Amino acid sequence: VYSYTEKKRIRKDFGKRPQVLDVPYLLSIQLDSFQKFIEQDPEGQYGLEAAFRSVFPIQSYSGNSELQYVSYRLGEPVFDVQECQIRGVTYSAPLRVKLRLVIYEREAPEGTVKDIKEQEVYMGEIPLMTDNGTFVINGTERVIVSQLHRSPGVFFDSDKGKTHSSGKVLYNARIIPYRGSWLDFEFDPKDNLFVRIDRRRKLPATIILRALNYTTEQILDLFFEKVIFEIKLQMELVPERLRGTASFDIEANGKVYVEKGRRITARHIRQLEKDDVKLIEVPVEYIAGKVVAKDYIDESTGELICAANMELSLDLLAKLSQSGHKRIETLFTNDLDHGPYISETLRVDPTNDRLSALVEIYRMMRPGEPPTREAAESLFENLFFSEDRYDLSAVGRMKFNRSLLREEIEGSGILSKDDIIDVMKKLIDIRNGKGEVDDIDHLGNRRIRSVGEMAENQFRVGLVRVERAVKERLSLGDLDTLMPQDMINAKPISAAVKEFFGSSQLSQFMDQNNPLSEITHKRRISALGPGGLTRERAGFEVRDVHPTHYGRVCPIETPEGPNIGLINSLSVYAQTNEYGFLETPYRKVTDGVVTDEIHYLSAIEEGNYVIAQANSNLDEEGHFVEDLVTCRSKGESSLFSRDQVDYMDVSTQQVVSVGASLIPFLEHDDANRALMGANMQRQAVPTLRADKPLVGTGMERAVAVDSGVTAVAKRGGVVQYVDASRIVIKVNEDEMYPGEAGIDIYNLTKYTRSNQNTCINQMPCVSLGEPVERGDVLADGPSTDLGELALGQNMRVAFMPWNGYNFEDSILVSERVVQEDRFTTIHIQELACVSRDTKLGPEEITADIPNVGEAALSKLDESGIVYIGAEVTGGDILVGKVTPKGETQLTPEEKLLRAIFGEKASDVKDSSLRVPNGVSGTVIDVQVFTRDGVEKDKRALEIEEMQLKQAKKDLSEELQILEAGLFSRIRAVLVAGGVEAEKLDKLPRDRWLELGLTDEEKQNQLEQLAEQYDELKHEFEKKLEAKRRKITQGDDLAPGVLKIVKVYLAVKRRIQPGDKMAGRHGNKGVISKINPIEDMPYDENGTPVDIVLNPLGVPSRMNIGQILETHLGMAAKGIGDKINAMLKQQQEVAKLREFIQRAYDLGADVRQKVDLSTFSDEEVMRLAENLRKGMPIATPVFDGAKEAEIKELLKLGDLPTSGQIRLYDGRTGEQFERPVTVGYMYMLKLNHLVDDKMHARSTGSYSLVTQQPLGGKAQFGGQRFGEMEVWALEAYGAAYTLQEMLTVKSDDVNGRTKMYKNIVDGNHQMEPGMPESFNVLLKEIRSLGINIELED
Amino acid sequence: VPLDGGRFATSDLNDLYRRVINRNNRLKRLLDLAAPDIIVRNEKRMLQEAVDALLDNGRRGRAITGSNKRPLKSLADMIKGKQGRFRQNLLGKRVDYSGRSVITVGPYLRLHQCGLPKKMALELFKPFIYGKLELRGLATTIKAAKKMVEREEAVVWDILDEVIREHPVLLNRAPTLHRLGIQAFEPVLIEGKAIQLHPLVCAAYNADFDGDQMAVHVPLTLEAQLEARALMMSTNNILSPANGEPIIVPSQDVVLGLYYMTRDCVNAKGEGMVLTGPKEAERLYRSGLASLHARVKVRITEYEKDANGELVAKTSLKDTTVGRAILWMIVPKGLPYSIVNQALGKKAISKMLNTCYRILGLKPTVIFADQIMYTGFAYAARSGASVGIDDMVIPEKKHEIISEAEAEVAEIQEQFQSGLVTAGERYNKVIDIWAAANDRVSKAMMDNLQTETVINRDGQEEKQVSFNSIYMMADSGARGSAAQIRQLAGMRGLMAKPDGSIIETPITANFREGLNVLQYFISTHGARKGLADTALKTANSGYLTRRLVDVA
Ligand SMILES: [Mg+2]
């Protein structure tokens, strides 16, 4: 089975490896996120429901009045996508929420209420996402790129011992919430545990424990074990504790257990445990340095003998013994394993009780204010533990529980005491050599934010502002007769949403160079933006490719420049977990069989499995072939036995992104060259006619269709009508939705401007009566050819020097390539003329202009606006406008001139739109916007009339289509009687209603359908009125502008020396010459070579996939030429069938299998006609075509297997020695045109404050003469060149004006003077209060 | 300043002055009202804060902000910070009479001239054209001349050609690292919109032709023109100022042409012939009666300055190839014949140019460089040297070497598993084994690639240097080295880790074959590091150079 669009031209496919999983919908991340955002969710946890439930209900002081939330909805947008783009307004929907205010009376707060007021309130408009994943914000399509940010939870790390001279690692922990403060624990160089709250001054860690109502004894009990001394002077012994160098060896059972001096060993512990040793005697000296555990007092006088966590001495021991204390508790410690860390901090902790700790925290928080008990308590209890001020999101709670090894996925978003205790315990455990730190680049630790979440955060911010405002309003008064609509101000809510969507770092203009650029822009992951790291604070730790990127983020496609490794691209099969973590699919492996069920594994979950490789040989039954198979275990890769592998890669492309999966022979390219190739391939400019690649990878069709450029059929059927601007499909009877007419109309997008000023144009690729099915393409967009992506052209290329015209990276091009308009592009640009009102009066758009002698008024109509379709060159007038001016104050020698010649002043200055210099196109569209008060001119009324006619026509079509369904329904209910299967159809269609059957369900249904028909008629009259109102209504122009005239010019740029051209393998160059055809190298048949490339560029830049592409393209074109020769002699279809069949089955057991026995003669001839320009070939990325297959394909044609032929010199006819490599390569025209880059200036406008030439080509600016150029001129002895650069050419007003007069007088001399910059500097310094002066 | 639509744009100094004046007037009012001391003290503190924020914003309690939430720019902030007058406008500023555009090759040019677009030239030299038009009477006034140039009348192009005749233009490329980044050339008016740059100067600019752009400035004064002609001309700067070596050496295609021309093979057409001179050699080569690599005997006459500058001549019968005799026709007089009697790789050509400069002078060297460039281009084109897949010949015994290395590493691993060697020792052992295997593979590849068998004058086997295109490119110095050929036809080698360590198992596949998906990940590991290091090195070098020019 082959698709009808895919059966016209089948691309021969190598790629032995089978396919088990098909590429998913590419731009599904954006659509899923935004769908989750705006969606009625019964249990509010996504989007607007979550925000409303999190903020509302809002309660006033004492709970006298409560504001509740009920539901929300989105109305239909007033302007659709096309109208929004046309008139430069956002495409959004109004969010209307039904709130309910309830007022409580006195007496019992919980009970009856005075009354309730429920009302709908409008709060802001939310932008809507187009069906392709874009937002129309101000008439321009935007894209909001996902963000890769460190997920909330607890992370343990260390400084690697580099912040201190001693070079000792200082561990630390950090709790990062979704919103809140950062509770960080840290180890001081002296091993003292400190804590910081917002990266502020340090405090002893245990202070926080004292802030949680913990005593010293409780602290030591939690963070230490206990040892008991009994009295004489007998201590209980635990064999495990004394793992290991002892003062007193042992005293157990009296006789002997071990001698002095020898370190305790495992055998000693075994003997002790076997003998059941529980108590022993030790010398008092053994307790010299121990620390008491709990407080000890005296029963005689109730005096504190010694406080807890205090040093123990012999005198204290004697006092306790004589005071009647027998059990003494000390803290089990050990310099190696159980080092003393909490005890030292306690001895260094200033605080003694809760109040002191709270006051210290308060003073650290907001210093300078007088602390108070209630104030400190409130501050601490609100810092965390408060829902409104601290949130540990569900993902944060999940990671927090997992990190501390808990089985509870869910919980609360507020830190408890157990959480902090466990975090401190685990940090101590890490310090004691037991445990591992966390890696921060691990993709198991980084999460992805999308549009539907970044927008939800901003909406909730606005809603919190509203909560503040309404609570303030209810604080005072609480008057009655107050509806829930005077408290809600829309602007605060809309402010955040507008700021985010319009002016944000992650919301950027879309790339519309071609479908690939759009696709790769929509699925782009950025580490920058709000809440993420910055360019100047990201080291190579985060800019490098981690082992966890395998299958989730592409390692090749990344920008090269200031931010390399901070912006990456999602992989082909990568998917986002429920929490926001990238996950990738692996085909499960049973005991020995590789089953076909896929599991999506995340970075953390993938570590503890053994995953085979996609290029692993499999038997027909699924069993592995080799005894040992290469698999990538936790961190590395190695050979594993056949029976200990539990997953396999689902494809060979799943490691690369869509951009890098379109490069054939990628594995033969150096990584740098592949990176450059992808980045440049994103920049190809669509040309006049699309040209499919002769060598592809099979990903062209997916990228073309999954982009919105093509027109894809929604339901199958037969093409009823085709036209240059519409397709009418007659749906099949199987999928009719019986209530519908059964036809679908696709309106094609004709010549339209893109963000890059290129041309967007859809043209049909179907004919009348041609069957179609669901998913087939019907109209190719820009850079698509019968549904396949086609970014460039197949050029016949030769590798040889040819006289230094391809010296470094230059390219020598033939004139046959310029004659055939292969790399000719169409560009569309709009120019605006704005007529405002000035103080002296209004500005007029008119055809009568001063000082223009009717030469430039040829193309202007009676209203002063250029005719549509006119061919205009640089300097011509497009719209004629004049501005009122004031008195001119003529000078002498000019007053006399006017007196002599008697010519009065015009009184109006000429300020009219004119074509920029160097541009020459044709006016294809003119549109005029007038303010509601101003009167429309003739041209505006003409345009309005045309629009009205078009709207009427379209609405008539819609009505005629709709009435057919109702007539079908009528005919359906007239079947069981009074039905003439033959006679009825011939009479007028409108008589269906007249006939009546009987007083039954049939007549009632007929009458109801007649009423529905009348309702439909009235409805469409209403819709015609609506369209008329939309056309004729005034425009919401900016204040002060009377009207705007926009003129669209369509330039057609050819290819010229200086234009940049590149292939898919990171091989770029600049055209150096357009050689005549009779000068190009030619072969024995006289066929010239389109392009000549330098071979010296291949060895150093080890991208030898271009040579393989050249050889395979030569083979494909040879097959195509043989088919063309067969087809041009009008041979029988049997010969073509045989040849095409034997050309579609080559290689070492490829997966593709096309059978031409099932092709009808018409289909075979159609396929042959589509293949006469070359047979397309597919070469998957890491599963491509082997060299032997290329040789065999070359031999199928009559070409030499070497890939090299003998060439002759066009100039002399002498054959080149040592034959050269010729073939076909796919060349692109990158969007770096010399037309947009040539700039020259002699004099122009100057800046305002510092009188220097403006900058840029648009400003007609100058070239910056930086400091290094000054150093270069100082290295020479060029003093006069430097001086004239510094003064007369830049900012010496009198000097620069005298130089011009000198030059026009044939006198090349200057009187420089002093630049204005130094004068500004002197004035600024004098303003500072200093007295800087120029002496004499 | 007023903008369109009634909107205004103002500096931040207006806000600071307004605040100062407001607080000062309020203080005077309070002193007038005899207010309690607390209020006047607070007002005086506010006035102090306002004045200090006016003079310098940052260095005090936070910093005042405007309508938006960015800090206001004070007087001090307008003088410093790399955006002030000292560094933003007083040493580097935008200039008139300047343009920029992409650059192309133009191999026909002479060393002292560059190709300039006609439209750029018309825009840059506009006042000169007005002066010429008025001077010769073709225009009554400057307005008439302006209209004439705007309409681009026929005479305007003749006037432009007259103006451009002898008037240098400075060409500059953005990263000006040394003083050879600016040079003066004579314009040659061309069509199109791309500047044509002589190949020999590219190395001085560090420029290639894959999208680079250049800026062009035009001197105005007579002193500036004479400085451009006598100081900055491209025919004056042929030696590097860092070291006295030449800096106009032919780079990659000229070298390939001259290496192919001056090269011998065992048996070619017309071997053993005796020629009357270089002219007969060229006549035979062009008639097709002899090969460019044919060991013949030629009567060569060479001059020598073995006196007080006399150039005495000696005639003899040298043994050379046809190509060397042909090449000898461009060498100036005073040089010997042994310079062009070898293979002439990359270094030999530079040595030849240096000898010419030191023996003869400047002008002969300037002519010699152009002749070398032309001949190299011509004969590189004539050779038809290309690159194919079959040129990358993999050793026939690579797989055996890989198998031996695998066996040895397996033996070492199982020996470690028996507790005879520690982890570090066995890791070093495996690293050494793989290094030895890589060296053996490289040696086999190079030995198989650098020679070929040709037969013969009589019929016997005889080895000679290979004519493999890859080997010719690498050996002549035109492009490539040993590492690139090793990666293409040997084994890609031993990779590193982000930690900086070395992965024990290397990439055993080359680029003629393919790297599997697991071997292509380790390569991406290193490419990213390379790019980042390049950026860092550029930044550090710039900072060092600035600090070094500041002191001296
Ligand atoms: Mg470059």
| Domains of chain A, CATH where assigned | 25-151+440-570 (no CATH), 152-224+339-439 (3.90.1110.10), 225-338 (no CATH), 571-651 (2.30.150.10), 652-708+784-823+1054-1237 (2.40.270.10), 709-783 (2.40.50.100), 824-934+1035-1053 (2.40.50.150), 935-1034 (6.10.140.1670), 1252-1336 (no CATH)
Cα A931 to Cα A1034: distance, rounded to the nearest angstrom: 6
DSSP lists the bridge partners of residue A632 as: A611, A637
Sequence-ordered alpha helix ranges (H) in A1129-1172: 1133-1143, 1161-1170
Kind plus residue range of the DSSP H or E element containing B6: none
Largest distance between two CA atoms of chain A: 141
Distance CA A253, CA A239 (A): 15
Annotated binding residue at B208? yes
Beta carbons of A185 and A429 less than 8 angstroms apart: no
* A402 burial type by CB count under 10 A (0-12 exposed, 13-18 middle, 19+ buried): middle
Distance CA A1224, CA A1121 (A): 13
Confirm or reject contact between A163 and chain B (CB < 8 A). no
Tell how far CA A19 is from the center of its chain.
29
Among A681, A615, A708, A624, residue whose Cα is nearest residue A654: A615
Residue B90 and residue B200: Cα distance in Å, rounded? Answer: 35
CA A269/CA A241 separation, integer angstroms? 10
CA distance A1199 to A1201: 6
DSSP-derived letter for residue A1269 is: H
d(CA A588, CA A645): 9
Q: What is the DSSP letter of A174?
A: E
Q: Do A1219 and B222 touch (CB under 8 A)?
A: no
Pick from A1265, A1291, A1323 the residue to mutate for testing the B interface (most B CBs within 10 Å). Answer: A1265
Instruction: Report the SS3 class of residue A711.
Output: strand
B550 in reach of chain A (CB within 8 A) = no
Structure token digits, residue A1219: 């034959």
Q: Which residues pair with B201 in a beta bridge?
A: none
Helix (H, G, I), strand (E, B) or coil at B63: coil
Is the CA virtual torsion A1016, A1018, A1022, A1028 positive or negative?
Answer: positive
Tell me phi and psi for residue A1075, to 5 degrees.
-75, 140
Structure tokens at B369: 């460089």
Sign of the CA dihedral with A958 first, then A964, A966, and A969 last: negative
Closest CA relative to residue A11, chosen from A700, A681, A767: A700
Experimental method reported for this structure: cryo-EM
- Distance in angstroms (rounded) separating the CA atoms of residues A7 and A134: 33
Backbone angles phi, psi at A390, to 5 degrees: -145, 130
Provide Rg for chain B, Cα atoms: 35
* Residue of B104, B252, B514 lying closest to A1058 (CB–CB): B104
Inter-axis angle of helices B154-163 and B142-151, to 10 degrees? 110
Instruction: Compute the Cα dihedral for B146, B147, B148, B152 and give only its sign.
Output: positive
Could you tell me if A673 lies within 8 Å of chain B, comparing CB atoms?
no
Residues 6+ apart with CB under 8 A from B19: B50, B53, B54, B64
- Tell me, what amino acid is at A1036? D
Look-up of token digits 């050889």 = A1111
Q: CA–CA separation, A846 vs A681, rounded Å?
A: 47
Residues A741 and B274: their CA atoms lie apart, in Å, by: 95
* Burial of residue A491, with CB atoms counted within 10 A of its CB: 0-12 exposed, 13-18 middle, 19 or more buried: exposed
Tell me which residue in B4, B142, B518 faces A1304 most closely, judged by beta carbons.
B142
Q: How many of the other CB atoms lie within 10 Å of CB of A616?
A: 17
Q: Kindly report each contact of residues A765-769 with a partner whose C-beta sits within 8 Å and lies 24 or more positions away, as own/partner.
A: A766/A719, A766/A722, A766/A727, A767/A719, A767/A722, A768/A719, A768/A720, A768/A721, A768/A722, A769/A718, A769/A719
What is the rounded distance in angstroms from the CA atom of residue A1290 to the CA atom of residue B171? 18
Q: Which residues contact A252 (CB under 8 A, 6 or more apart)?
A: A237, A272, A275, A277, A280
Of B105, B125, B124, which is closest to residue B194 (Cα–Cα)?
B105
Contact A463, A52 (CB under 8 A): yes
Q: What are phi and psi of A23, to 5 degrees?
A: -65, 130
What are A435-441's contacts with CB under 8 Å, separation 24+? Answer: A435/A156, A437/A156, A437/A157, A437/A158, A437/A171, A438/A155, A438/A156, A438/A157, A438/A403, A440/A150, A440/A155, A440/A157, A440/A541, A440/A542, A441/A541, A441/A542, A441/A544, A441/A546, A441/A548
Task: Read off the tokens for B507.
Answer: 């990439």
Interface of A with B in 1059-1088 (CB under 8 A): 1060, 1068-1072
| Beta-sheet pairing, A524-526 with A507-509 | unpaired
* Cβ <8 Å between A672 and B527: yes
**Ion ligand 1, residues whose Cβ is below 5 A away:** B 208, 210, 212
CA distance A1057 to chain B (A): 7
Angstrom distance (rounded) from CA B471 to CA B447 = 11
Give chain A positions within 8 Å (CB) of B470: 1099
Q: How far apart are CA A1058 and CA B104, in angstroms?
A: 7
Distance (angstroms) between ligand 1 centre and the Cα of A208 equals: 59
Backbone angles phi, psi at A566, to 5 degrees: -95, -20
Paired residues of A794 in beta bridges: A1226
> What secondary structure letter does DSSP report for A391?
B
Give the residue on A whose Cα is nearest the Cα of B88: A1266
| Centroid of chain to Cα A290 | 61
Closest C-alpha among A783, A784, A752 to residue A141: A752
Q: How many CB atoms lie within 10 A of CB A590?
A: 10
Number of H helices and E strands in chain A, helices first, is 32, 61
Give the gap in angstroms from C-alpha A144 to the nearest C-alpha of chain B: 24
Q: Is A840 exposed, middle or buried (0-12, 13-18, 19+ CB in 10 A)?
A: exposed
Interchain CB distance below 8 Å, A1303 and B131: yes
Strands (E), A1054-1167: 1060-1062, 1068-1075, 1091-1093
Ligand 1 midpoint to CA A1069 (Å): 9
Rounded to whole angstroms, the Cα distance separating A1209 from A1083 reads: 9
Helix or strand or coil: residue B457?
coil
B105 CA from centroid of ligand 1 (Å)? 13
- Between CA B339 and CA B336 the distance in angstroms is 6
d(CA A957, CA A174): 65
Touching check for A120 and chain B: CB below 8 Å? no
Full strand arrangement of the beta sheet holding A141-144: A135-136, A141-144, A507-509
- Quote the tokens at residue A483: 């509806």
The answer for A1174, left when phi > 0, alpha when psi is -120 to 50, beta otherwise, is left
- Strand positions, DSSP E, B282-338: 296-304, 312-320
Helix, strand, or coil (residue A32): helix
Alpha-carbon gap, residue B469 to B392, rounded angstroms: 9
B526 to chain A, any CB pair closer than 8 A? The answer is yes
Residue A639 burial by CB count (10 A; 0-12/13-18/19+): exposed, middle or buried? exposed
Spatial CB neighbours of A1307, under 8 Å, sequence gap ≥ 6 = none
**Chain B nearest CA to A1070, separation (Å):** 5
CB contact under 8 A, A550 and B521: yes
Q: What sign results for the dihedral spanned by CA atoms A331, A334, A339, A340?
A: positive
**Cβ neighbourhood burial of B413 (10 Å; 0-12, 13-18, 19+):** middle
Contact A836, A843 (CB under 8 A): yes
Q: Please give the helix or strand (H or E) that residue B2 lies within, else none.
A: none
Eight-class DSSP state of A992: G
Please name the residue that has the structure tokens 């049909």.
A764
C-alpha to C-alpha distances, B403 to A162, B82, B399, B410, nearest whole angstrom: 44, 61, 6, 10
> DSSP letter at A846?
-
- Contact between chains at A632 and B518 (C-beta distance less than 8 A): yes
Largest CA distance in chain B: 125
Nearest-CA distance B131 → chain A (Å): 4
H or E segment at A45?
A: none
DSSP code at position A990: G
Measure CB to CB from residue A556 to each of B378, B514, B524 and give the nearest one.
B524
Q: Enter the tokens of residue A1185.
A: 């075509």
- H/E/C letters for each residue in A941-957? HHHHHHHHHHHHHHHHH
Q: Give CA B414 to chain center in angstroms.
A: 52
Are residues A1281 and B227, on separate chains, in Cβ contact within 8 Å?
yes
Question: Which of B57, B191, B195, B45 has its CA nearest to residue B118?
Answer: B191
B232–A1184: do the CB atoms touch at under 8 Å?
Answer: no
Cα angle for residues A501, A507, A509 (degrees, 5° grid) = 110
Single-letter amino acid, residue A558: T
**Contact of A383 with A182, CB cutoff 8 Å:** no
Distance from CA of B546 to the nearest CA of A (A): 9
Closest CA to A777 of A724, A720, A742, A727: A727
Distance between CA atoms of A1022 and A1014, rounded to whole angstroms?
12
Sign of dihedral through CA atoms A370, A376, A378, A383? positive
| B91 at A interface, C-beta within 8 A | yes
Q: Does B70 touch chain A (CB under 8 A)?
A: no
β-strands A146-150, A446-449: how paired?
Answer: antiparallel
| B112: closest CA of chain A, how far (Å) | 18
List for chain B the helix, strand, coil content (%; round to 5): 50, 15, 40
% helix / strand / coil in chain A, to the nearest 5?
30, 25, 45
- Calculate Rg over the CA atoms of chain A: 41
B391 in a known ligand binding site:
no
What is the token pair recorded at A960? 């005629």
Phi (first) and psi of residue A845, to 5 degrees: -95, 110
Please identify among residues 55-84 of chain A the ones whose CB lies closer than 8 Å to any CB of chain B: none
Alpha helices in B114-270 (DSSP H): 118-124, 126-135, 142-151, 154-163, 202-205, 222-230, 253-261
Query: Does residue B141 belong to the interface with chain A, where contact is any CB pair within 8 Å?
Result: no
Inter-chain contact A1276–B231, Cβ cutoff 8 Å? Answer: yes
A1217 touching chain B per CB within 8 A: yes
Distance separating alpha carbons of residues A730 and A720, to the nearest angstrom: 6
What is the Å distance from ligand 1's center to A1068 Cα? 9
User: Which residues of chain B make contact with A1291, given a CB cutoff of 8 A?
Assistant: 89, 93
Q: How many CB pairs under 8 A join A and B?
A: 431
Q: Are A652 and B515 in contact (CB under 8 A)?
A: no
> Exposed e or buried b for every residue in B102-118, given b needs 16+ CB within 10 A?
bbbbbbebbbbbbbbbb
d(CA A482, CA A103): 10
CA distance A314 to A289: 10
- Show the tokens assigned to B446: 């190079």
Interruptions in chain A after residues (C–N over 2.5 Å): 231, 244
For residue A286, the SS3 value is: helix
The SS3 of residue A715 is coil
The pairing of beta strand A1263-1265 with beta strand B98-104: unpaired
CA distance A145 to chain B (A): 22
Q: B253-261 and B363-383 helices cross at what angle (nearest 10)?
A: 80
Residues B211 and B138 sit within 8 Å (Cβ to Cβ): no
Neighbours of B539 (CB within 10 A): 10
Determine whether the interchain pair B252/A1237 forms a contact, defined as Cβ–Cβ distance below 8 Å. no
Tell how far the Cα of B334 is from the centroid of ligand 1, in angstroms. 40
Q: Which helix (H) or strand (E) holds A306?
A: strand A304-306
The sign of the dihedral angle between the CA atoms of B354, B355, B361, B367 is negative
Token look-up 């004239």 returns A1284
CA of A103 to the centre of ligand 1 (A): 73
- Angle (CA) A961 A966 A971, round 5°: 120
Q: For B74, which residue in chain A has the nearest alpha carbon?
A: A1328
| Ramachandran class of B207: left when φ > 0, alpha when ψ lies in -120 to 50, beta otherwise | beta
Tell me whether residues B104 and A1095 touch, CB distance under 8 A: no
Closest CA to A782 of A773, A790, A774, A770: A790
Q: Does B418 touch chain A (CB under 8 A)?
A: no
Residue recorded with tokens 């007496």: A107
| Contact yes or no for A1187 and B97 at CB 8 A | no
A1057 to B192: CB separation less than 8 angstroms, yes or no: yes
Tokens describing residue B366 = 């300037």
Tokens of B518: 């697991």
DSSP state of A1236: G
What is residue A1329's DSSP assignment?
A: T
What DSSP string describes A532-580? S--GGG--HHHHSPPGGGTTTB-SS----SSSSSSEEEB-SS-EE-SSS
Distance from CA of A215 to the nearest CA of B (A): 40
| Partner A contacted by B220 (CB < 8 A) | yes
Q: Which residues of A touch B382 (CB under 8 A)?
A: 1209, 1216-1217
A916 close to B (CB below 8 A)? no
Rounded CA separation A222/A227 (Å): 14
